[PDB]
Amino acid sequence: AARRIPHFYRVRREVPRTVNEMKQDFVVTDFYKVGNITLYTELHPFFDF
Amino acid sequence: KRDEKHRHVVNVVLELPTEISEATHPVLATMLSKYTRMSSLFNDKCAFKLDLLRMVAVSRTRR
Amino acid sequence: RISALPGLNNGQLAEEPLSAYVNALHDHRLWPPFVTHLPRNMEGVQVVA
Amino acid sequence: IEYSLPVPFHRFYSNPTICAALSDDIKRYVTEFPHYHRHDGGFPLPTAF
Amino acid sequence: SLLHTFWRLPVAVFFEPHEENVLRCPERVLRRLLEDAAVTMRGGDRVRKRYLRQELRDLGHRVQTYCEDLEGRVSEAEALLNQQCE
Numbered sequence: 001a002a003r004r005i006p007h008f009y010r011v012r013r014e015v016p017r018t019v020n021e022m023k024q025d026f027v028v029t030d031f032y033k034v035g036n037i038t039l040y041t042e043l044h045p046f047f048d049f
Numbered sequence: 050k051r052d053e054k055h056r057h058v059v060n061v062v063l064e065l066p067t068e069i070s071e072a073t074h075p076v077l078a079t080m081l082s083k084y085t086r087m088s089s090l091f092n093d094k095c096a097f098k099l100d101l102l103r104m105v106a107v108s109r110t111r112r
Numbered sequence: 113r114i115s116a117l118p119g120l121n122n123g124q125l126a127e128e129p130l131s132a133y134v135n136a137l138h139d140h141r142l143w144p145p146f147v148t149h150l151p152r153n154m155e156g157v158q159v160v161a
Numbered sequence: 162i163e164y165s166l167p168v169p170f171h172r173f174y175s176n177p178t179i180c181a182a183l184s185d186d187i188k189r190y191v192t193e194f195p196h197y198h199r200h201d202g203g204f205p206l207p208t209a210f
Numbered sequence: 211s212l213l214h215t216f217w218r219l220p221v222a223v224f225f226e227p228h229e230e231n232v233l234r235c236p237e238r239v240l241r242r243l244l245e246d247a248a249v250t251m252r253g254g255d256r257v258r259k260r261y262l263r264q265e266l267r268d269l270g271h272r273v274q275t276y277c278e279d280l281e282g283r284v285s286e287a288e289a290l291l292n293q294q295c296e
Binding site: 002003004014021 | 166167168169184186187189190193194197202203205207208209
């Protein structure tokens with residue numbers, strides 16, 4: 001694992017943000033608005049989907 | 050005979066300079082007592098050097 | 113750190129990243145008045161003597 | 162620098178600056194995608210981690 | 211390398227990429243993709259068996275030699291207890 005680390009970065013390919021990562025930049029007052037794309041995910045407080 | 054193997058594991062393997070003979074290190078003789086018993090790991094001589102280095106380190110403690 | 117919003121600047125929509133889109137302090141078009149070197153990237157910049 | 166390898170393995174302890182300094186290819190990854198130079202854990206970790 | 215087409219005249223592409231498939235292809239992205247694939251592939255025996263067999267046989271024979279020498283010592287030297295050899 002350690003020795004292989006540089007080879008991943010040798011590829012010039014950006015990666016997609018996860019849904020959980022995207023959900024963390026919606027400020028509090030508009031997390032409830034239509035523009036919150038991720039809202040269909042948020043079914044359960046204790047669980048991630 | 051044993052001349053070849055000990056010369057090998059001193060000068061060829063360990064790359065240790067010629068002035069460092071068996072007399073200048075008793076611990077070196079005690080270690081080549083062990084080293085020549087196995088004929089592997091001779092490609093990565095750095096392992097043998099690090100083992101000798103740490104052995105001489107532990108031999109030189111105060112306690 | 114104050115210059116551009118790190119919460120929202122996670123991505124690109126052209127060669128330029130969003131941090132360069134949101135504040136001129138980031139983009140490669142605003143040069144400093146004094147230069148000791150030339151910059152790494154000059155995509156849409158031509159320099160004239 | 163001659164005897165070290167940088168290991169980003171956590172959403173902390175994964176500073177882009179150190180990794181880009183220590184290895185050439187990670188620095189290429191950063192310069193091609195400058196938006197990844199954030200510190201909020203959105204920097205891509207290798208797929209193993 | 212080139213491609214031979216039945217229609218001599220091409221068509222201009224229209225409508226979305228979700229009703230007919232099309233290989234769009236800027237040359238730079240294809241070159242970058244090929245280099246990236248090349249680096250990705252390389253970035254992700256019997257002599258050893260002979261070494262192992264030789265070392266195993268030598269360990270066995272060396273154990274035999276040590277045991278033989280030890281037994282010879284325990285015989286010869288301790289035989290002196292009874293003054294067998296004058």
